[PDB]
Structure 1
Amino acid sequence: VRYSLDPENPTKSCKSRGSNLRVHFKNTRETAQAIKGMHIRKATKYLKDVTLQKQCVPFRRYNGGVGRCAQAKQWGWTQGRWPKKSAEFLLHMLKNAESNAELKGLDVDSLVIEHIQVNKAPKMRRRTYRAHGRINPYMSSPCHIEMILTEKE
């Protein structure tokens, strides 16, 4: 399809997109603002240390009630968290971006992540059962995430 902000040079740029996939929106938004502008082999290595809880993800915007961890000092912040389901869905797609790069005849040793956005998908619902005969929803909030990779040279 058509993305947000077509890159300045499409010959030496690669891209991926993942639609309608079930993560939390808010935690995936903030593991993507950690790796924006980051090189792919650093981003692939940083995302492993989130799932192994050796290096965290600072929660900068959607941070209501998010507790504090010492690994958030590298980011200049206080609050941080380690979303492992979110760090696998945009690591399984970061492989897809370097799977598309070698089909486009591009070098992966200089690919950086220029553009990455997460925005919301339609919420799919199920319902819970509260006091006094009441129903209230467990609405799930999945997301469309979307990324551009560019060689620097």
Structure 2
Amino acid sequence: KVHYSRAPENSTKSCKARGSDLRVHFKNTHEAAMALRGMPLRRAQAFLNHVKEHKEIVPFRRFHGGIGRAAQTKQWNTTQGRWPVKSADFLLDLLKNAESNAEYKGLDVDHLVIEHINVQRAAKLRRRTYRAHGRINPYMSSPCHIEVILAEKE
């Protein structure tokens, strides 16, 4: 339903994958995805698994209000990072789908590189929270659309 923000330089040696209205935090997922820019596919998968294992950190470059400091942030030339596990899982699922698409189109999976990746805000989901003095406030979820384009690099 959501069009890709970009198009591959050449659609013959490239594959795409998409996901809409995914119930993950848009900010965490956006930082995690932006950490994957330019990585080879295997490096990206290893990085996401390391994030799940607390062996590598996702640097929070934009939505870093109140985020804590850690030793692993040094490798990204920043002082704030985290380990968004749900985002890592969703991105791993998307990369798996893109790999399956590459196999379907007959491309060397061992030479795929993340040519493009993007995360966008989706329509919010609504819930309620109850406050003092008989008041009600919104309790909203901010899901995201994710899109990835892998390319065959020579």
Task: Output the TM-score relative to the length of structure 2.
Answer: 0.97
1:49 Cα deviation after fit: 0.6
- Which amino acid in 2 is paired with 1:16? A
Structure 1 residues 20-59: aligned runs within 5 Å: 20-59=21-60
Residue of structure 2 equivalent to 1:147: 148
Q: Structure 1 CA distance, aligned partners of 2:85 and 2:6?
A: 29
1:99 Cα deviation after fit: 0.6
1:54 Cα deviation after fit: 0.8
1:94 Cα deviation after fit: 0.5
Counting matched residue pairs gives 153
Residue of structure 1 equivalent to 2:87: 86
- Which amino acid in 1 is paired with 2:78? W
Residue of structure 1 equivalent to 2:61: 60
Q: Structure 2 CA distance, aligned partners of 1:130 and 1:143?
A: 28
Residue of structure 1 equivalent to 2:138: 137
1:5 Cα deviation after fit: 1.4
Q: Structure 1 CA distance, aligned partners of 2:70 and 2:4?
A: 35
User: Which protein has the bigger strand share?
Assistant: 1
Report the identity percentage: 71
- Which amino acid in 1 is paired with 2:133? H
1:137 Cα deviation after fit: 1.0
Where 2:55 maps in the other structure, the secondary structure is: coil
Q: CA offsets per residue over residues 45-82 of structure 1, 9 Å max, x none?
A: 11001011111000010000000001000001111100
Residue of structure 1 equivalent to 2:74: 73
1:93 Cα deviation after fit: 1.0
Q: Which contiguous aligned blocks of 4+ residues in structure 1 show a shift greater than 4 angstroms?
A: none
Where 1:103 maps in the other structure, the secondary structure is: helix
- Which amino acid in 2 is paired with 1:58? P
CA RMSD of aligned residues (A): 0.8
- Which amino acid in 2 is paired with 1:84? V
Structure 2 gap ranges (5+): none
Q: Structure 1 CA distance, aligned partners of 2:81 and 2:5?
A: 28
- Which amino acid in 2 is paired with 1:36? R
User: Which protein has the bigger helix share?
Assistant: 2
1:109 Cα deviation after fit: 0.9
Q: Structure 2 CA distance, aligned partners of 1:142 and 1:121?
A: 5
Q: Structure 2 CA distance, aligned partners of 1:23 and 1:78?
A: 24
Q: Structure 1 CA distance, aligned partners of 2:120 and 2:138?
A: 21
